[PDB]
Scaffold this active site. Structure first.
Site, PDB file in Angstrom:
ATOM      1  N   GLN A   1     -35.417  19.979 -11.342  1.00  0.00           N
ATOM      2  CA  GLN A   1     -34.533  18.823 -11.203  1.00  0.00           C
ATOM      3  C   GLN A   1     -33.401  19.020 -10.192  1.00  0.00           C
ATOM      4  OE1 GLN A   1     -32.705  17.489 -14.855  1.00  0.00           O
ATOM      5  NE2 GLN A   1     -31.343  16.037 -13.805  1.00  0.00           N
TER       6      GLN A   1
ATOM      7  N   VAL B   1     -36.198  12.704 -10.157  1.00  0.00           N
ATOM      8  CA  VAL B   1     -37.130  11.574 -10.190  1.00  0.00           C
ATOM      9  C   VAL B   1     -36.431  10.216 -10.108  1.00  0.00           C
ATOM     10  CG1 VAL B   1     -38.840  12.877 -11.511  1.00  0.00           C
ATOM     11  CG2 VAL B   1     -37.203  11.396 -12.732  1.00  0.00           C
TER      12      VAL B   1
ATOM     13  N   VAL C   1     -40.500  14.547 -18.526  1.00  0.00           N
ATOM     14  CA  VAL C   1     -39.068  14.408 -18.305  1.00  0.00           C
ATOM     15  C   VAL C   1     -38.539  13.150 -18.985  1.00  0.00           C
ATOM     16  CG1 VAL C   1     -39.276  15.549 -16.047  1.00  0.00           C
ATOM     17  CG2 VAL C   1     -39.187  13.054 -16.165  1.00  0.00           C
TER      18      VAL C   1
ATOM     19  N   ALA D   1     -31.347   9.689 -20.914  1.00  0.00           N
ATOM     20  CA  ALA D   1     -30.463   8.549 -21.075  1.00  0.00           C
ATOM     21  C   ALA D   1     -29.072   9.145 -21.194  1.00  0.00           C
ATOM     22  CB  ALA D   1     -30.828   7.733 -22.301  1.00  0.00           C
TER      23      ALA D   1
ATOM     24  N   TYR E   1     -31.874   7.356 -31.609  1.00  0.00           N
ATOM     25  CA  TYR E   1     -32.856   7.425 -30.523  1.00  0.00           C
ATOM     26  C   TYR E   1     -32.675   6.197 -29.641  1.00  0.00           C
ATOM     27  CZ  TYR E   1     -37.039   8.985 -28.035  1.00  0.00           C
ATOM     28  OH  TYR E   1     -37.929   9.432 -27.076  1.00  0.00           O
TER      29      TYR E   1
ATOM     30  N   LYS F   1     -39.422   4.436 -24.056  1.00  0.00           N
ATOM     31  CA  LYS F   1     -40.722   5.027 -24.375  1.00  0.00           C
ATOM     32  C   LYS F   1     -41.776   3.939 -24.552  1.00  0.00           C
ATOM     33  CE  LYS F   1     -39.957   9.478 -24.282  1.00  0.00           C
ATOM     34  NZ  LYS F   1     -40.541  10.380 -23.241  1.00  0.00           N
TER      35      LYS F   1
ATOM     36  N   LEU G   1     -34.043  21.803 -25.161  1.00  0.00           N
ATOM     37  CA  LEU G   1     -32.719  21.516 -24.618  1.00  0.00           C
ATOM     38  C   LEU G   1     -32.380  20.050 -24.818  1.00  0.00           C
ATOM     39  CD1 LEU G   1     -32.409  23.579 -21.290  1.00  0.00           C
ATOM     40  CD2 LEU G   1     -30.919  23.683 -23.312  1.00  0.00           C
ATOM     41  N   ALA G   2     -33.304  19.170 -24.442  1.00  0.00           N
ATOM     42  CA  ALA G   2     -33.023  17.749 -24.521  1.00  0.00           C
ATOM     43  C   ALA G   2     -32.889  17.278 -25.980  1.00  0.00           C
ATOM     44  CB  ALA G   2     -34.103  16.958 -23.791  1.00  0.00           C
TER      45      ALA G   2
END
Ligand SMILES: NC(=O)c1ccc[n+]([C@@H]2O[C@H](COP(=O)([O-])OP(=O)(O)OC[C@H]3O[C@@H](n4cnc5c(N)ncnc54)[C@H](O)[C@@H]3O)[C@@H](O)[C@H]2O)c1
Ligand SMILES: NC(=O)c1ccc[n+]([C@@H]2O[C@H](COP(=O)([O-])OP(=O)(O)OC[C@H]3O[C@@H](n4cnc5c(N)ncnc54)[C@H](O)[C@@H]3O)[C@@H](O)[C@H]2O)c1
Ligand SMILES: NC(=O)c1ccc[n+]([C@@H]2O[C@H](COP(=O)([O-])OP(=O)(O)OC[C@H]3O[C@@H](n4cnc5c(N)ncnc54)[C@H](O)[C@@H]3O)[C@@H](O)[C@H]2O)c1
Ligand SMILES: NC(=O)c1ccc[n+]([C@@H]2O[C@H](COP(=O)([O-])OP(=O)(O)OC[C@H]3O[C@@H](n4cnc5c(N)ncnc54)[C@H](O)[C@@H]3O)[C@@H](O)[C@H]2O)c1
Ligand SMILES: Oc1cc(Cl)ccc1Oc1ccc(Cl)cc1Cl
Ligand SMILES: Oc1cc(Cl)ccc1Oc1ccc(Cl)cc1Cl
Ligand SMILES: Oc1cc(Cl)ccc1Oc1ccc(Cl)cc1Cl
Ligand SMILES: Oc1cc(Cl)ccc1Oc1ccc(Cl)cc1Cl
Lengths: 259, 261, 261, 259
Positions: free
Chosen positions: D39, D66, D93, D96, D158, D165, D197-198
């Protein structure tokens, strides 16, 4: 009727063919008091005339380009000068640049076309829910949007609008899950193909119309009167057990796989 | 109301708590003329009593064990001597042997338990559609059945009723595809949990109730009034654009994967 | 291959065209040791012949009409005198009386046609799960069945098999929920149309084939090799994170609503 | 192994815990030749070191934010100096802004947070499909992305990532419908919750983990090894009959309502 005493804001009237016009007419028939937005000053006059025939009036018509947070907030600020509360918001709006909807999905879809399609067709529903939250507080009201089978399964040219509708339907559920505790229900109608201004812009629309006509269980296409009755019901206390739902009004086409 | 002019047959009233009673009350309120079936003579007295409170009478109440084709066919033969034709059939009936719904799915489910669950809970909707087809011809009427989220996703004890409900929902779609051309719409309400005679038979039903109340978007359980109103709408000309649909009346519980923090 | 070390029971081989044959060939290629059932003595000879070509032998072939609990149980009793345990069961069996799949759904579907369709096509998967549970105990193995899009959405003639497949798919989920804790995964492949013995019995099957070829994203029909590979994968430890899944192997046809312009 | 002779580009490696790392390891094990993106220059070094252990090398690692069309095109331009064709693209990937994922959905979701979530998490998959189309021409290859149950049903926090998604999964279908005729398959894995991590950025992630653990049929959570095996399978010729599919690798949690 079963919406007597209800106040509804209707977003998306463009012509007498509009799904929003079918919903407006049904809601008025059932006793709802109505207000409207218009996208720009070219549609303003027509929306004003329509409002006058649905028990409403030009001073209950407000400018709203749903790309614009300021305009959206200004709708509720203006409306609040006339109404001390709001029960219903109908979100009947969509857009993607024409070049997104004509050709091979991979070839023609772009970052900006994608951005616009999701912004106007999906985020704008969340924007209305947000801006109207205070006026709807304590009224046990409801939000309604409009979707299409293209969210779930594919067809030529609908392309990135299918992604935006999928986003929108997820939004229906997330809004329901968020606003339910304070009493607001959130639902959609997924309509079958109907000849509208917007439908005309899809070069292959007539093929969608034809497939639905031949393959749908009822063997005929649906009307804005039928979508309007479904929408009216969903925004009434008759539907007080229903939230987060995508209600198909397509004669049952979505339940078929006769390709 | 939005059903004045219509005639409906209601299959599944057992007590004041029944979902079929909530539907009958809504349809009566909205102007429908009602006829009824009762499973056997244990329920005849109560169904006849209730029918009289819903604009109906004992001579429009008929015995019908839906395991029995001849009883089913005799309902419409008998009813057709009072009624020209028929607009609506409401199918609000379910059964599986009790031991099928208590314990580990794999261990307690049997071939015979499976047969009965599917015969009574799923095939019987098809049987009513077939038997009533003549009386419904040309009337642009509708059929309504009742389902549950157990058809799509699992929970304890519902077990083989979940398979039967999945069968039933496919049945809604195949009936809609078959009968639509001649004008008949076919739908279902998938209701959230409601305290009824049958529901009380399910061990841990109390937990299903609590689960829904906490996790459903509306933070409350639904009522037979709410299911009744949805069913009434689906069987009205207001829903003339709607067929093959499984409409959830569960406050949105089916749309959640986890409850609030 | 990715199945060396595993033992699998394969139910549903009829001819070299069978889905179960595609699965058997793929699992054999990947190193599985195979055993087989044959419905009755009309298929015994071919099944024994095919088994010998897939690393197996007549002594690992057993009679099994899945209508019959005692035959099902006798399979595992007999197999258990050769194998001390079992990792995999492949359930590739379907049946409904012919007249159920020819014409208008409402007109031709009968209580008995429904019973048989669900008994053979859906309950039998549960019956295998139950009867093989002891042999699969502690093996962290898996079950696989086969389904079809007709479970979810309608097409001509598939009729009550569509209800049975919907029942079966719920069965996949309830079995997965029951058997998962002890280590067993339970899945299905939902195959696109393939010219098999059973498929050839369906009038307008050739239309189903042509429809899929034109409209499926890959613009070609699927093969039992492709279904066989997907099934082999689902029953391998490569798929150890996967249970309760209905995996479509249909070129993507199920994801389309209309074909290309 | 079952990917011998295949060349794959993997987009999304950030640490040893990454789903993309699980997919890379499985694909390399099965014989695939790998290339990577990173990234930014903070992740560049870590991705380069990981590549060296997966049969790859630093010169097969390329910068890619991206959000940036030119950077995406520059990846395939650079890779084409090394490879005369490409079989597989793995898209692992998402992003938000954190303020979107902490609190009431209606309250915290904004137009810009929405835009970013959809741009990075959904449109970027289409961008890769587009930019890699020439290199993949005639190879009967495949595209893989990663999704989550949040697309279909709701959970706290979420939020707008669920909308993104849902958009992505429609994208999988529209890409499949577009690229299939020329031989490309397009699929996703919908993974159960995994500590990455995310994931650690979602305030209530451990509650998601816990719900999955206690209610999923397998009664345990899945691993990046299990997700990587599924993804390796989907991108192999073993899966040549599968396209447009969302394959769940969550132990069956998605099939439960109370479990
Ligand atoms: N076959 C169909 O017509 C069909 C089927 C299913 C769903 N839908 C959906 O129904 C809804 C209504 O569309 P319709 O078919 O009635 O067409 P329509 O042309 O009558 O209405 C479309 C509305 O969108 C408004 N709009 C577009 N961009 C806007 C913007 N930036 N700001 C404010 N308003 C904007 C337009 O002014 C118009 O009023 C849409 O969401 C559509 O996707 C239509
Ligand atoms: N109560 C709930 O929470 C709930 C939720 C979803 C769906 N449902 C469904 O609603 C309907 C059940 O109604 P209920 O919950 O009001 O319970 P209920 O006990 O009030 O009614 C069940 C009905 O099934 C009838 N019945 C059983 N076997 C029969 C047979 N062989 N022949 C004829 N009739 C027979 C019974 O006589 C009774 O009238 C079922 O289809 C049920 O699966 C209930
Ligand atoms: N061929 C297709 O297009 C297709 C598509 C999707 C799903 N399926 C399913 O694949 C599975 C296998 O069918 P197929 O297409 O390979 O056809 P097939 O004719 O090759 O095999 C069908 C099997 O069912 C067996 N069977 C039938 N009744 C039985 C009974 N009472 N007891 C034991 N065995 C019995 C038959 O002996 C035969 O082996 C079925 O479940 C079918 O529904 C087939
Ligand atoms: N961890 C889970 O529980 C889980 C579950 C289901 C799905 N997913 C999905 O799998 C993928 C998540 O990755 P992960 O969980 O392995 O976490 P991760 O932190 O290891 O990977 C996230 C990746 O996204 C990259 N990324 C973020 N923004 C980018 C940008 N503008 N440009 C280029 N790269 C960018 C990051 O560099 C990182 O490599 C996502 O698609 C995620 O939504 C995760
Ligand atoms: O969503 C729709 C679906 C159908 Cl079948 C017909 C019209 C639709 O509505 C639109 C389609 C394209 C654009 Cl640009 C804007 C809108 Cl409102
Ligand atoms: O389907 C149902 C679902 C719920 Cl939550 C509650 C009751 C239900 O209805 C039944 C459940 C079991 C049996 Cl034996 C019979 C019936 Cl009518
Ligand atoms: O399920 C199937 C689906 C398809 Cl498209 C083709 C064949 C199928 O399999 C059967 C169909 C009918 C009967 Cl009686 C038995 C079986 Cl095994
Ligand atoms: O999609 C996910 C789902 C889960 Cl359960 C855990 C992590 C996920 O991945 C992300 C979540 C939030 C952000 Cl900002 C970025 C990413 Cl990649």
């Amino acid at each position: 009727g079963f919406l007597t005493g209800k106040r509804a804001l209707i977003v998306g009237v463009a012509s007498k063919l509009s799904i929003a016009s079918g919903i407006a007419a049904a809601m008025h028939r059932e006793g709802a008091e109505l207000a409207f937005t218009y996208q720009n000053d070219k549609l303003r006059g027509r929306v004003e005339e329509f409002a006058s025939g649905w028990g409403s009036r030009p001073e209950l018509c407000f400018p709203c380009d749903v790309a614009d947070d300021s305009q959206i907030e200004a709708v509720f600020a203006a409306l609040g000068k006339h109404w001390d509360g709001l029960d219903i918001i109908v979100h009947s709006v969509g857009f993607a640049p024409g070049d997104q909807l004509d050709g091979d999905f991979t070839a023609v879809t772009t970052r900006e076309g994608f951005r616009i399609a999701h912004d106007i067709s999906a985020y704008s529903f969340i924007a209305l829910a947000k801006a109207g939250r205070e006026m709807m507080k304590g009224r046990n009201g409801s939000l309604l949007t409009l979707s299409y089978l293209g969210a779930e399964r594919t067809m030529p040219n609908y392309n990135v609008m299918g992604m935006a509708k999928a986003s929108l339907e997820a939004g229906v559920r997330y809004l329901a899950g968020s606003l339910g505790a304070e009493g607001t229900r959130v639902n959609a109608v997924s309509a079958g193909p109907i000849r509208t201004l917007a439908a005309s812009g899809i070069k292959s629309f007539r093929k969608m119309l034809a497939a639905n006509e031949r393959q749908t269980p009822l063997r005929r296409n649906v009307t804005i009167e039928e979508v309007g009755n479904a929408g009216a019901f969903l925004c009434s206390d008759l539907a007080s057990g229903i939230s987060g739902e995508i209600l198909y009004v397509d004669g049952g086409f979505n339940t078929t796989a006769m390709g």
